[PDB]
A paper describes a structure:
Here, we present a biochemical and cryo-EM based analysis of the earliest period of 50S assembly, utilizing an in vitro reconstitution system with purified rRNA and L-protein components. Taken together, early 50S assembly occurs in a domain-wise fashion, while late 50S assembly proceeds incrementally.
Interestingly, the globular part of uL2 is present on domain III only after core formation in state C_L2 and binding can occur later in state C-CP_L28/L2. Late 50S assembly, apart from core-stabilizing incorporation of uL2, involves stable binding of bL9 and bL28 in state C-CP_L28, which stabilizes the base of the L1 stalk.
Author numbering:
A (entry chain S): 1 to 86, 96 to 110
B (entry chain R): 1 to 103
C (entry chain Q): 1 to 117
D (entry chain J): 1 to 81, 84 to 142
E (entry chain L): 2 to 35
F (entry chain 0): 1 to 56
G (entry chain E): 52 to 59, 71 to 201
Amino acid sequence: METIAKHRHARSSAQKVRLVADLIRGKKVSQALDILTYTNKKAAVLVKKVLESAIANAEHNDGADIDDLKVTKIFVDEGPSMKRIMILKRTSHITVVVSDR
Amino acid sequence: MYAVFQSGGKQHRVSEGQTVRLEKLDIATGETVEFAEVLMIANGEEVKIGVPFVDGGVIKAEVVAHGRGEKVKIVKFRRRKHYRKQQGHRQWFTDVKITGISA
Amino acid sequence: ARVKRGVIARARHKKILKQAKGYYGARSRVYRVAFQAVIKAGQYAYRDRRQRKRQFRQLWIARINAAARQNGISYSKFINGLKKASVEIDRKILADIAVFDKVAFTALVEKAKAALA
Amino acid sequence: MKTFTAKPETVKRDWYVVDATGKTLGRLATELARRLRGKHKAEYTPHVDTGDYIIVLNADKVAVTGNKRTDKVYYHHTGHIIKQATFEEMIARRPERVIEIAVKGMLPKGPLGRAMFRKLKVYAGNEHNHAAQQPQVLDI
Amino acid sequence: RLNTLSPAEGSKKAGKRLGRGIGSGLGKTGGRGH
Amino acid sequence: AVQQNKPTRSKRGMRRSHDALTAVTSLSVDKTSGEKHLRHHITADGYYRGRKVIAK
Amino acid sequence: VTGSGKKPGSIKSPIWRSGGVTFAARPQDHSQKVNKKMYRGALKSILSELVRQDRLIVVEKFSVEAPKTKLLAQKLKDMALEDVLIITGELDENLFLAARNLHKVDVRDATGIDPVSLIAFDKVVMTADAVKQVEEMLA
RNA sequence: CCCGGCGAGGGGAGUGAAAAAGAACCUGAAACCGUGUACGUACAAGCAGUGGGAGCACGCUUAGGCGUGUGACUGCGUACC
RNA sequence: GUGAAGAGGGAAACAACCCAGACCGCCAGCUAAGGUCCCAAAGUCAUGGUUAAGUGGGAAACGCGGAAGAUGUAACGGGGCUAAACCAUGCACCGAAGCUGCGGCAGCGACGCUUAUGCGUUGUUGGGUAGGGGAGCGUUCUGUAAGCCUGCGAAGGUGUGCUGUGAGGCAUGCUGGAGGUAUCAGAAGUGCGAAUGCUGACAUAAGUAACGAUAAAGCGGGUGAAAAGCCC
RNA sequence: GAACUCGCUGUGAAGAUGCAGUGUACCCGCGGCAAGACGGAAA
């Protein structure tokens, strides 16, 4: 049993978001929130928001057991891009799956 | 307790109860064949050979299945010469269950 | 009546890429270089199959020379004795008997020495 | 049946000790290279180290053949914008260096060659500390 | 027999379509050389 | 001063192998508020070293 | 093809998007001249083949008093025929009036006999006058 | 209904046969960017493949030395038009 | 004679130097040139001799001298060989796709049955540019087809296995939810890897220049979740 | 075009990162020289 949260069309680069995500994958949620909230990357706020939404959905629709939450899968993938004249803006999708076990 | 014999022109060292691959032969599946051609017999004391075609060795071979070998693709190509051909190929093979060694 | 080439090109690319697996990135993903990779691999396989007989012949020669030296006889003299004694055992059989059972090879070389002169 | 292949963990390798004093350097070098290669053993395959460990002692009294004591010289370049070493000087300092150079020349070049060369143990003095492995002293 | 009639052998020939690969014989230069 | 070849994925991965960030792993719990906070910082509630601060 | 010949070669090129096809077909009739002797010989050969194959049935006269499709269906069922081609001489209003409704059953005159219909249809129903008319036509 | 910022977006429930049809809306390979899985690599040099090949996990014959995933190591090997 | 239009083996790497004209496959053998100290497979083989200088392992005329080889040994391929160099002879071995041993595929002459032929075979061919000739596979539509399969699952995409000397074909899990189509004949807008070919998407150098007159910015409060570029 | 992109000797469409021999080198980034760079240009 796991809860999936995917934020689409993120307004940030697909690399820096990946750099932020690399530091949180495989870490306990309790300390993951604290460590992520105290970083120097603007992309960190999007990750915090999506993780907060994921945990809120998990606790509302399923047993909270907030202490025993562990992140299993998390990844960022490049999203839609539009061509214009000054260039393409880079968008990303952020996906996080959290399971108690 | 093994033996050495050639049937399709290829030397084979086969022990009792060991399945070996031989070239295709016009041998029916329902009948056994005799390979009177022997070259060496392995036992507690090996039987030396002074001349080939030793009559003291009798080998019974029973074909159990038929088929072709693994498909192999041969490609002949030349650089800058616009010459290139490709063709698949396979070879028939037979398996014989060897029982009993004559000393 | 216009016809669409999508199906034929799709099938050709699929079949050619299927044989091209594990060629260090681009060669296994890009058709342009994948064609060269597969054709060169086929030619290399053909030539290596041709040379495999020679390679295994060299391996058997080395093993037989090692066995003869261990038994205390030169490889050339051993071959001369074996052939002049009316023995048609293939080098593969000699290597197999030498590696597996040492007593049999020792007896064979002793017999060759007996029928050497 | 497929050709027999020696398994690296199944190889049984012993210890051999050879003295180069009063011996032709070329012949003994070739013999050591052959023994390291494992080609002497019947169960030899040119893909794994089937040879035996070799120990060389008393390399100071190696017998020079002909007038190569001074005529023969080796040049090595450090790779800069050259180093000169005379045969007599290197012989007086450490004959093990020239012995190792010759052995490396004998062995095939490559990582496998380096791995096989790792088995050589050359000592300037007659005495050695490897006697704990009950090495078999063979004179050749 | 509803529709099975076919032309006799040799009466109909598929012809030659040059400039189609190398397996079809002539495929380059259009047959006029360089 | 211009490119002549096409670097593959390996070069991009290796060059990007050193930009990975690291966790501070230095959070401290305030004695009074009992809430995690960074070392040598000021808590949101307005506490530091156990004494009172402006806490605006 | 409408466009512009100004150099950007030219936009109206076969190798560019929305470009004209260099080998563009043109409207030309595909009809091929067929000799009268060839047509007569083909008709004779097919007619001779049909009789030897027992695929041709000859009747004195096939007609219906009134243009009733149901009656024609019953008559065909009596003869155990479902896909047959009727060939006759003078056109009859009662029979011709009902011919298009049945796709497997159609009536034709000897003057405009079509070989493709004869070949495709399993069986052909002749007439006492129709056979004489067609044999005179071929001669 | 909840998180989110009364944004966007997401989750649950429900409609809908399908939401794996959600308005960036039929079917969705490749070039391109990843996750998890099995393997190899931090002392080894060159069209990066091939032949042999111990090892490392799995289905198997419910061992019988079979195949699948990678290939430590070496002989050979200077792209296409 | 070779390349042109022939691969292979040896000479370090080679198209004109030597041997040798590749139908395919088999963990078989015998040879040509070339080698038998290791690298690297075979004689550290046997007999009659030269070498003291590494000449061998580069050097004409002239009697060991005449005679210098270079980015780093660099004119034995490296070692070292006083014979592991060289002159002569003997028996051997290694040695290619050359020959033979086994299996298989296609064509071409010669025959006895035989016919719109398969056998018994008898010999041979199967490297190939330009070029010529012959034989075939894939797709649209048309008649076949108001036949057949198909919401119990068609195409299209995708994974597996089998099959054919080949282009290909066959069955099957999966998103997929509506068409496809046997055999036989007829036409191509018919098979893509390149022409600085065109259209849509994307890696690339890379999170690298730089963020554009060097007039210059701040403090408290307010709105805003988030304020140093918003307001006071 | 793709590179698991080292230095010398010889060969080489004639000064070779990719051919033969030899030697060096744990993997990967950061600021400078530009000696290479057949990319422009400099008789």
